Design a binder for this molecule. Sequence first.
Ligand code: FES
Ligand code: FES
Lengths: 68, 67
Amino acid sequence: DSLINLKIQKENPKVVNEINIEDLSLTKAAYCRCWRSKTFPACDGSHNKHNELTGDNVGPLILKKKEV
Amino acid sequence: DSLINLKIQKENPKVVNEINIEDLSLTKAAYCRCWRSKTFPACDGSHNKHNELTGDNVGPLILKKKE
Ligand code: FES
Ligand code: FES
């Protein structure tokens, strides 16, 4: 029964982020599911240190947008 | 120093899920960031029980199509 989010918007009772698909410009964009990214909601690779430290296996959600 | 993901795909060293945006069927789709959903990588509202149990404030990432 451990907290998952330690640092992000603790004054907020539920941190929910929205992505409007039409705004995604990159063919590939990674979003954080570990709550350790310094650019949250984006993934910055911080999951890797978390995984090494705790022995976890978390990773990001990758949103893929085909080239029109 | 504690685990975030307790039970999802433990045989996999790093769980990464790819979403093909062009194939979203719903205008609003919620994706799990708590690692408790029974429909992972989709959010099924399991974050609410996690938050109540632990006092946390995690919630989903929501993808929205153009209006
Ligand atoms: S930094 Fe959190 S999933 Fe990559
Ligand atoms: S069930 Fe995990 S964020 Fe909703």
